[PDB]
Structures are given as C-alpha cells and as structure tokens.
Design a binder for these strands. Structure first.
Ligand SMILES: Nc1nc2c(ncn2[C@H]2C[C@H](O)[C@@H](COP(=O)(O)NP(=O)(O)OP(=O)(O)O)O2)c(=O)[nH]1
Ligand SMILES: [Mn+2]
Ligand SMILES: [Mn+2]
Length: 538
DNA sequence: GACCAGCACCGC
DNA sequence: AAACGCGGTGCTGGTC
C-alpha cells in the first residue's frame, strides 16, 4: 500500500496497537488507517484519535473504549470479527480470523489497518445472500458494540474499604480452618494443592475414592466428591469451607479493590462480543458475570457493588428465560400454558425437592431447583440426578420421565433440531444465529451424544442471548435521554444506574422495553428492583 | 518474568 | 464424578 500522510479520509479502516489487552488500562502505542489503496500512520497516536469520526476495523470496540476513556466520542462501526463470528462462532480471535479469510494478524498498526480493510471486504462478500445473518449484524451486533463500549468505559462503583475490612475478617477464619485441617491430617501440607490433598484423603486417611479427573485420571477432590464424603471424616467439612472462603477471597474480595481505575474511581470489565459458541457475551478482566451471590459471604460481596452518590442501581432479570424460549421454539401447548397462567417452574421444583410450601422457598433452594430443571432438560442422567436430589436412582429416573411427559412437544423439538443439525451441519437460533456441530455424525457414541447436548442447547441459550442483545440495543438510547447509565449485563440481566429522582421511571421503562423486545408465544416477564447496592436491587 | 495444562469453583 | 449447557479465574505444578 502507498504510505500517505495522516489524517486518512472519512470511512477508513483503523489499526491500533495496545500495550495490554484491557482498553481502559492500555497505552495506545500506535495508530494507523487504510483506504483507497493507501495507509496512514499517525505520528502521535493519542492526538491522532481526535481525527477519527468512527472506529472501523478489527476490535473496533476496544479502541472506542479507549477513546471514551480519553473523553472522545468515537463510536465503533464495522468490525470483521463480528462478521466472522456470525458466519461461525468458532471465529473468536483475530489470529484465527486473519489466517482463515486472507491475512496475518501482526503487531504493527499499519498492517492491522490494511488487514481490517482486506478482511472486511472478503467477509462481507461471504455474507452476501445470508439475509438473516446480515440482519443480526446490522440490527444487533454492530449497534451493540457501541452499547458495550459505553458500558465498559463507564464502570461500576465498588466499596473498597468495605472489601478491605472483609478480607482481614475472612483471613482469620481461613487460618482457623487451615489449622483445623492440619491437626486432623497430623501434619502440615499445602491445602491448595489438590495432589497433596488427594494423598491425605485417600492414602493417609484411607477415605474411599468416588471419581477420577478427566485428563490425568487422578482421584478427584472436587466439591461433588467431598460432598459425598461429608460424613466420612470431620476433615471433609473443614475442607469444603476452606475451599469456599479461599475461592471468594482469592477471586473477588482481594483482587477487585486493586482494579479501581485512578481516573474514574470505578471498576471496569470487558464485554467480549465474539467469545462464545451460542451467541452469549462473556466478561473478563475482571469477570463481573459470576460475582458471588449464593452464600451469606457471597451476598456480602454483592453489597460491595454500589451506586454513585445520589444515584440508585436498577437490576432487571428475565424470569425463567430459557424455559419461556423453549415454549416458543418447541410450541408445547402445556409449557406455554404454564407461563400464561403465571406459574414458576423453579419454585415448583424447589417446593417438591425440599418438601415445603412455595412461600418457604428461599433463594438458595431456588438455585438448587434451577440446576435440576435445566440439568434434566439438557440431558442430565438419572445417576447424577439421584445424587443431586439425594433420592434413590429409581425415583430419579421417574423424575426425568414425568418432566418430559409433561411437555411432549419438547422431545419432538429436540429430535427435529438434531436432525436438521445433522443434515445442514449447524443449528440455529430464532433469529438465524448459527453454531456448527459436525460431531453430530461422529462414530463414537460418547462424542456424538456430547455434541447432541451442545447442539439442541444452542438454539435455546442462543435465542435468549439474541433477545437480551436486541433489548440492550433498544434500551440504550432511551436511557441516554433519561440521564441513566447501563453498567453491567449478566446474560439475561441488566444493572443500570439512574439519578435517585429518576430511578423509578427508568425501572418502569427498562422493564417494558425488555418484556416487549420481541413478542413470543409466551409473555416475557422481568423482575425489577432498586437499591443502593447490587444485592438490594435484586 | 511469561506461558501453559490441569484441576477446581464462581454464576448465568 | 456421573450423558446438563455456556463461560472466566485462582492455584498448583511445570516449562522456558
Ligand atoms: N444449562 C443450564 N443453564 C443455566 C443454568 N443456570 C442458568 N442457566 C441459564 C438458563 C436460565 O434461564 C438463564 C438465566 O439464568 P437465571 O436468570 O439465573 N435463571 P432463570 O432466568 O431461568 O430464572 P429466574 O430469573 O426466574 O430466577 O441461564 C444451569 O445450571 N444450567
Ligand atoms: Mn432470569
Ligand atoms: Mn439472571
């Protein structure tokens, strides 16, 4: 390409190099652009950002986030990654997309700009005729990237002092647990080492080995195994408690306070748009889509996520989302009637397994019911179900029988989905998002049946993701007009931040937008709450 | 220091 | 652990 002077013409494809993957923390090391057979390299990247009206190219969102960090309104536009991701969700990295569609992903901005131009031309050509995939690109993914950019650049407020004090408290308790484990073992050892713990439990203490690990075939010390051994030795109980606290302390309590950005004073995650096989987003650096919430200590961690002074958090979460999607996709009249009558399958399964009235079901019980309802739906075995439900194997097999017998159209849909996946080689969501599942024709049963479970799950989970994404695209401009912020997304949930005097109005509006994003054969219901912290708003 | 495989874990 | 699915992160143990 002919090297031309900065700036480039409007509509050029951008290429950029970051000192680190996180745009909110990265130094913009180089900036370049390409169009019309030319390449423009910026003398000073930061100054050069002011010259762009739109970020078109690979990882456009990341550059837009960095521009927002610097107070620049540089929205993301076309991104070859989103085109490749829609053609095949296994296209998740620029390294692979480049090598697959005509280029090489290097570490030079000028080459990345030229690569973005070449890959867009080729990928856009491959989507000619894919009307449904082009609709998802034009109406969902491309506009969503702008929404995610603003979310990432905004961040969430965290109660640092609260978590600092919590760290010191949990530390003392971990010391009491580790000292108790060492005494029962008769000697000290690295309790974090599952190899050393394996010997203590199964060689020294002589406890029975329940299961083995996948790759190396060692005797597993997983929670499920230890749960089965909860009454075989007092050490097992202390280990489970040690595992819980060290996990929450090492992954959330201690790391998150150190990630507050100096310029914003807030915590900034990344929402990765081409990371999953089903169309879901993912969150990383740090992951804010798996913040603790189940246990009492987990709830205390949620409370650390707070609203800015004078603001309130608004949390909206779809009710029984994939079950409602399943009703629409399958067309089972019985399942449809469940939601038309306002029933809650999670509560009903919870009341059955715990033997208590509906009003006695606590959040912990309901989460346990979710595992069963979705576990059974997506192919859980009676053997595992018997252990999860703590019932005889014969009763567990009966549970799976009544489950599908209650909704006979579900099985018919599963077989229709798998058959089409075998013939076409991919399954699709309600909006046409595809996932290629070639192992549906595999000759090894284990491999084949694994692909099958992945296959007919993707339309359900993927449609829910399509719906959530479309709702985010619709809702974002409405929140801007009301002075509200979109902070976090958790697959079927949104966390917003609104002025105290507008929180009620935002909550009502966001609820309506989410529930009416795309009318289905069943109503989409959203649970909404308002509070100064994430747990309160739930 | 950086990277990795493997086990284990958090929540959707 | 096991015939639920989708992710990301910490630790250990190992390498370079
Ligand atoms: N296969 C599978 N899918 C799951 C699991 N947990 C969550 N999902 C999927 C299916 C879920 O629909 C979706 C959202 O998870 P939630 O919002 O926590 N549960 P929901 O919306 O169903 O119920 P409600 O909001 O009334 O409490 O994530 C699981 O253990 N397994
Ligand atoms: Mn939900
Ligand atoms: Mn949810």
């Amino acid at each position: 390409l002919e090297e031309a002077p900065w700036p480039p013409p409007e509509g050029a494809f951008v290429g950029f190099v970051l000192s680190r993957k996180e745009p909110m923390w990265a130094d913009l090391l180089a900036l370049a652009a390409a169009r019309g057979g030319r390449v423009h390299r910026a003398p000073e990247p930061y100054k050069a950002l002011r010259d762009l009206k739109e970020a078109r190219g690979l990882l456009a969102k990341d550059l837009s986030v960095l521009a927002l960090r610097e107070g620049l309104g540089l929205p993301p536009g076309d991104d070859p990654m989103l085109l490749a991701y829609l053609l095949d969700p296994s296209n998740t990295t620029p390294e692979g997309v480049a090598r697959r569609y005509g280029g090489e992903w290097t570490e030079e901005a000028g080459e990345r700009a030229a690569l973005s131009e070449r890959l867009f031309a080729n990928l856009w050509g491959r989507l000619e005729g894919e009307e449904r995939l082009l609709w998802l690109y034009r109406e969902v993914e491309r506009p969503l990237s702008a929404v995610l950019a603003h979310m990432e650049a905004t961040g969430v407020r965290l109660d640092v002092a609260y978590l600092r004090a919590l760290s010191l408290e949990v530390a003392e308790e971990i010391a009491r647990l580790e000292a108790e484990v060492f005494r029962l073992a008769g000697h000290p050892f690295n309790l974090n080492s599952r190899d050393q713990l394996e010997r203590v439990l199964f060689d020294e203490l002589g406890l029975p080995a329940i299961g083995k690990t996948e790759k190396t075939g060692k005797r597993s010390t997983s929670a499920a195994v230890l749960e089965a051994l909860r009454e075989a030795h007092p050490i097992v109980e202390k280990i489970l408690q040690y595992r819980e606290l060290t996990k929450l302390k090492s992954t959330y309590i201690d790391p998150l306070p150190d990630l507050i950005h100096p310029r914003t004073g807030r915590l900034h995650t990344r929402f990765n748009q081409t990371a999953t096989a089903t169309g879901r987003l993912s969150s990383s650096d740090p992951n804010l889509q798996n913040i603790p919430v189940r246990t009492p200590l987990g709830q205390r961690i949620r409370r650390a996520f707070i609203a800015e002074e004078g603001w309130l958090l608004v949390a909206l979460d779809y009710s029984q989302i994939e079950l409602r999607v399943l009703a629409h996709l399958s067309g089972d009249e019985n399942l449809i009637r469940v939601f038309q009558e306002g029933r809650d399958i999670h509560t009903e399964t919870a009341s059955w397994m715990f033997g208590v009235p509906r009003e006695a079901v606590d959040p912990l019980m309901r989460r346990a019911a979710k595992t069963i309802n979705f576990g059974v739906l997506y192919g859980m075995s009676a053997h595992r179900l018997s252990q999860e439900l703590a019932i005889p194997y014969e009763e567990a097999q009966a549970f799976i029988e009544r489950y599908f017998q209650s909704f006979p159209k579900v099985r018919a849909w599963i077989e229709k989905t798998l058959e089409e996946g075998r013939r076409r080689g991919y399954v699709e969501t309600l909006f046409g998002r595809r996932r290629y599942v070639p192992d549906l024709e595999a000759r090894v049963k284990s491999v084949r049946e694994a692909a099958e479970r992945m296959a007919f799950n993707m339309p359900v989970q993927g449609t829910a993701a399509d719906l959530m994404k479309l709702a985010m695209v619709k809702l974002f401009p409405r929140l801007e007009e009301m002075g509200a912020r979109m902070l976090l997304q958790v697959h079927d949930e949104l966390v917003l931040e609104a002025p105290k005097e507008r929180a009620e109005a935002v909550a009502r509006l966001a609820k309506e937008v989410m529930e009416g994003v795309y009318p289905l054969a069943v109503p989409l219901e959203v649970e909404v709450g308002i509070g100064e912290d994430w747990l309160s708003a739930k």
